[PDB]
From a paper:
Extending the labelling experiments to other GTPases, placing a cysteine at the position equivalent to E35 in Rab1b led to covalent interaction with aGTP for all those tested (Rab5A, Rab6A, Rab7A, Rab8A, Ypt7, HRas and Cdc42), albeit at variable rates, but substitution of cysteine at positions corresponding to L125 in Rab1b only led to covalent reaction in the case of Rab7A. Structural comparison of these adducts with Ypt7:GDP and Ypt7:GppNHp demonstrates that the covalent linker provides sufficient flexibility to allow the covalently locked proteins to adopt similar conformations of the nucleotide-binding pocket and in particular of the switch I region of Ypt7Q35C–aGDP, Ypt7Q35C–aGppNHp and Ypt7Q35C,K38I,Q68L–aGTP compared with the non-covalently nucleotide-bound proteins. Despite this flexibility, the electron density around the nucleotide and the linker was well defined in Ypt7Q35C–aGDP and Ypt7Q35C,K38I,Q68L–aGTP, whereas in Ypt7Q35C–aGppNHp this was only true for two (chains A and B) out of four copies within the asymmetric unit. In conclusion, the structures of Ypt7 modified with aGDP, aGTP or aGppNHp are very similar to the non-covalent Ypt7:nucleotide complexes, demonstrating that the structural properties of GTPases are maintained in covalently modified proteins. Additionally, covalent GTPase–nucleotide adducts also maintained the native structures and conformations, as demonstrated by the X-ray crystal structures of Ypt7Q35C–GDP, Ypt7Q35C–aGppNHp and Ypt7Q35C,K38I,Q68L–aGTP.
Proteins of the Ras superfamily of small GTPases regulate a variety of cellular processes such as intracellular transport, cell shape and motility, as well as differentiation and growth. For all of these processes, switching between the active GTP-bound and the inactive GDP-bound states is of fundamental importance. We describe here the synthesis of reactive acryl derivatives of guanine nucleotides that are able to react covalently with strategically placed cysteines in GTPases to lock them into their functional states in an irreversible manner. Extensive analysis of biochemical and structural features demonstrate the maintenance of the signalling ability of the modified GTPases.
Author numbering: 7 to 35, 40 to 65, 75 to 182
Write the structure that this text describes.
């Protein structure tokens, strides 16, 4: 029924921006709401409501998917991806750590090339080493790939929700 999605990653990577792009299709250069909600549409039907939880017992409870976000211009954000994945599994008490879904987002892909520091290859290798986690490279700013990425986040959440 309701899909709970958590977004983790270092501060400054674009977690809040990606949520706003997904939820409201906007971006500019929310206090008091623990989550924002967006109706998921698949094949032109409304199938479910997604809660997107941006950055605790009630915090982890009920999570259906976990999204991990680095910034392709910040090397340290990328090196911390496995830490965030691990921090989640160690605290969230999920029914089946073996099968719980993560999705990795490499954000700010709109940046000039000279400012990119993390290569696509390195990210594909890490996503693989972590259990073949889906990898998307994204731009909240320019609306690049966030639709396709959340399409897979929603699909992962739906599968976990109904398991
Ligand atoms: C409009 C002026 C500007 O910020 N220019 C730089 C564009 C670089 N490209 C870019 N920047 C992004 C993207 N998403 C988010 N941002 C920027 O990152 C910081 C922090 O974002 P936030 O969403 O607050 O991160 P956390 O919640 O993870 O802390 C902000 O400057 C935001 O504008 C993106 O796709 N591309
Ligand atoms: Mg934020």
């Amino acid at each position: 029924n309701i899909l709970k999605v958590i977004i983790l990653g270092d501060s400054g990577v674009g977690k809040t921006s990606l949520m706003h792009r997904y939820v409201n299709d906007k971006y500019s250069c929310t206090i008091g709401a623990d989550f924002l909600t967006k109706e998921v549409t698949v094949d032109g039907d409304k199938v479910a409501t997604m809660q997107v939880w941006d950055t605790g017992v009630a915090f982890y409870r009920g999570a259906d998917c976990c999204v991990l976000v680095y910034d392709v211009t910040n090397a340290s954000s990328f090196e911390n991806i496995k830490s965030w994945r691990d921090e989640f599994l160690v605290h969230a008490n999920v029914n089946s750590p073996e099968t719980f879904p993560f999705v990795i987002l490499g954000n700010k892909i709109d940046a000039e090339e000279s400012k990119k520091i993390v290569s696509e290859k390195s990210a594909q290798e890490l996503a693989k080493s972590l259990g073949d986690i889906p990898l998307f490279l994204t731009s909240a700013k320019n609306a690049i790939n966030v639709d396709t990425a959340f399409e897979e986040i929603a699909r992962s959440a739906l599968q976990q929700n109904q398991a």
